[PDB]
Amino acid sequence: DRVYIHP
């Protein structure tokens, strides 16, 4: 799934 995953 997500993480620090920023746009």
DSSP the chain: --SS---
Breaks after residues in the chain, judged by C–N over 2.5 Å:
none
CA terminus-to-terminus distance, the chain: 15
> Largest alpha-carbon pair distance within the chain?
15
Alpha-carbon distance of 2 to 7, in angstroms, equals 11
**Cα(1)–Cα(6) distance, integer angstroms:** 13
Task: Provide φ and ψ at 2, rounded to 5°.
Answer: -60, 180
